[PDB]
Write a protein that binds this DNA or RNA. Sequence first.
DNA 1: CCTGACTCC
DNA 2: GGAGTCAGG
Length: 549
Amino acid sequence: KMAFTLADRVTEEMLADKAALVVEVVEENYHDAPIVGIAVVNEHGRFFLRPETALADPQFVAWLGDETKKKSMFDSKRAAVALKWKGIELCGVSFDLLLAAYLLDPAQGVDDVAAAAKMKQYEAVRPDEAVYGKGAKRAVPDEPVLAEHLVRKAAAIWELERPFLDELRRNEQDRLLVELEQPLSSILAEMEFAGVKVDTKRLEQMGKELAEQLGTVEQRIYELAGQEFNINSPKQLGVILFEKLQLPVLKKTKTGYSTSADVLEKLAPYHEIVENILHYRQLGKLQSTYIEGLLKVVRPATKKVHTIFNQALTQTGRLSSTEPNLQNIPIRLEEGRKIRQAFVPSESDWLIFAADYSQIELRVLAHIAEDDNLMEAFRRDLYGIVYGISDYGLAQNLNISRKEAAEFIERYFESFPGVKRYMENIVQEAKQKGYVTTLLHRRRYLPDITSRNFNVRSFAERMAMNTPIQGSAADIIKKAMIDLNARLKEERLQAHLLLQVHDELILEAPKEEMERLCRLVPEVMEQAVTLRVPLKVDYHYGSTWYDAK
DNA sequence: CCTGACTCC
DNA sequence: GGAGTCAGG
Ligand SMILES: Nc1ccn([C@H]2CC[C@@H](COP(=O)(O)OP(=O)(O)OP(=O)(O)O)O2)c(=O)n1
């Protein structure tokens, strides 16, 4: 039971200075995607608008871009970007229910209005998947069924804003939402829409040469193996290694023999085929993911790739990057690192600028553990612990004796008693409170932390150790991003952000601005928050992302 | 569609 | 510790 007006045209009462707004983009990847419908809920009533009509209306477009007309939405970035592709600016977004839900509890995995409403027992709205359907059945339903959904979603947002803000305020997270995540969302929207330009000629040439080399390595493997098999099948590979060649089985998973990189490396003294296999799988991933996969999503006319930064997914407060993922482009082996030569500025006589925090997580450990020996070390400017590594895990990682690994860790805690203290204290806090928190009050709940089951419990305790560290770094670089764009905009530099990579920011700019960026960027990033230790940032620029080192 | 690869922070 | 994509099955 909910009345609404199926409008044939926009009226003045639709354009109030506060509204719940739904700009519906049904395709998961919203870049250049259709807007299938619009809904507005305000003091005056509920309205559905056809996008052809509304978006072609100069008064509705004006309202959309008016910062003083406040909108409450769910996933405003999706809307803001889809509107950019329609040549329309979205302003005045004051509340995002997606981001509010994420801050309240990231484990709920809220990705539609219905799921957010569930957190307040609000039931007068359907899940999106139930309206549109799954997979090949996915479709926009008949207008009256569509219109009712969009309106119900707007009505839900309208009624849920204050209950959500009230709870955020109770948790002291309202500023985290309004001053950080919400402004970050607009910045991410800008980055996504700008995209990153790709040198397809170079990428395609790399692909051709990689293909030849895969063939050569492939044949060499079959020769060493004494047989042809699918190297990309862990199962067939297992038979070759552990049955035909009779190499030792160092690890098994629930499906059979492990052929992990760690395991194969340890088998190098037994047979020279394992090294070749490792090489083959490296090359094949470069080809399948960073040449072919990347070329598939390049927009041919502009040669740009447009990632989507998921702001409400990770359990720690980090972003993730999808379709394509630009936060896992190779760098560690020169062979893969060369992929970065294909990422270039979007304008002639521009350069790529790259700035990275040095050891941000170990410094956060220092700051939050208040370890003197660790803080003193950073003031002189002089990881496994941070992930809760065992003696076993460390022995294996370093391929050394466990006794020696265990002694390394025991020594470590003896040497850093304040870190050892933090670890014990943060776990105890998690057990007492049921959640851990970050510098800017991001939380993660850990309902398993008192499980009687050793493995379940242990994993939870490790999360208690790590999340405040990783999450606090996420908080910092996010703050650094918001401040940076402000510092860029005032002094009207043309430079703009392209990418964030966890503890790194990647920009493009006219070559003329490099000197000013060498000053501005590292400063802003270091002055993002003030810790007990100093924040350090390294920076480079160059003709391509590769050269920015 | 899941698992186990390789990739980053 | 936190992520995404890919091929095989
Ligand atoms: N209503 C609030 C209050 C705080 N915060 C987040 C944003 C910044 C961070 C700092 O909190 P402050 O009040 O400025 O410092 P504090 O009180 O000393 O924080 P803490 O309780 O952790 O010591 O917390 C928030 O999101 N919403």
